[PDB]
PDB file of C-alpha atoms in Angstrom:
ATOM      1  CA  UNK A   1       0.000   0.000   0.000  1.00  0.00           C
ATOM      2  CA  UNK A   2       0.885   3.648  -0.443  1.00  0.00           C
ATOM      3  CA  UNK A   3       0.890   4.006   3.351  1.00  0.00           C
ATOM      4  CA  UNK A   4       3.746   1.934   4.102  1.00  0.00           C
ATOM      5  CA  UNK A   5       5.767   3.944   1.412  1.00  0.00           C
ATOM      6  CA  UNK A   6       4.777   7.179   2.977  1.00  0.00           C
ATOM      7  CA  UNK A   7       5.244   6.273   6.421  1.00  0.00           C
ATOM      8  CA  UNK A   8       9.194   4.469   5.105  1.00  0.00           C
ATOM      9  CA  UNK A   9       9.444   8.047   3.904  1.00  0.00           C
ATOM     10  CA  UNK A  10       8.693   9.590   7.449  1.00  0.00           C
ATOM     11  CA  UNK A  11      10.423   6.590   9.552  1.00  0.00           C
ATOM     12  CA  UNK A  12       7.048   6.074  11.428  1.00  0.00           C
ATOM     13  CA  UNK A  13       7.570  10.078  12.666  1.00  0.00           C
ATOM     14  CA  UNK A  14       3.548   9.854  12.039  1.00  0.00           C
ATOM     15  CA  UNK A  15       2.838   7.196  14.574  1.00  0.00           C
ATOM     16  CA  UNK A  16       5.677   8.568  16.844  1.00  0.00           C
ATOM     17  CA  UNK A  17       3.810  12.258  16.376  1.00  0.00           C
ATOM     18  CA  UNK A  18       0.206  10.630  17.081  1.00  0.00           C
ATOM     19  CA  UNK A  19       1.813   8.408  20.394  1.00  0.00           C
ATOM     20  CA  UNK A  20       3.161  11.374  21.555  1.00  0.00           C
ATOM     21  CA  UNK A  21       0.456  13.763  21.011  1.00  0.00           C
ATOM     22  CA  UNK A  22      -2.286  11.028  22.125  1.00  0.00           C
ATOM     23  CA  UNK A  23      -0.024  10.954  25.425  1.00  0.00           C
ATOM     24  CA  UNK A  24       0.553  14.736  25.478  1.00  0.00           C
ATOM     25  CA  UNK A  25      -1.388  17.169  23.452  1.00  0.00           C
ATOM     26  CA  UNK A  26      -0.437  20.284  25.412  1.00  0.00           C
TER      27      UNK A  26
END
């Protein structure tokens, strides 16, 4: 799928970005 390419591309920065922010938003 396109996702895995795009998250290769970011080196799972999304998921680390959505962890973080869905265990700190603020």
């Amino acid at each position: 799928g396109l996702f895995g390419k795009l998250i290769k591309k970011f080196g799972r920065k999304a998921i680390s970005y959505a962890v973080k922010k869905a265990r700190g938003k603020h």
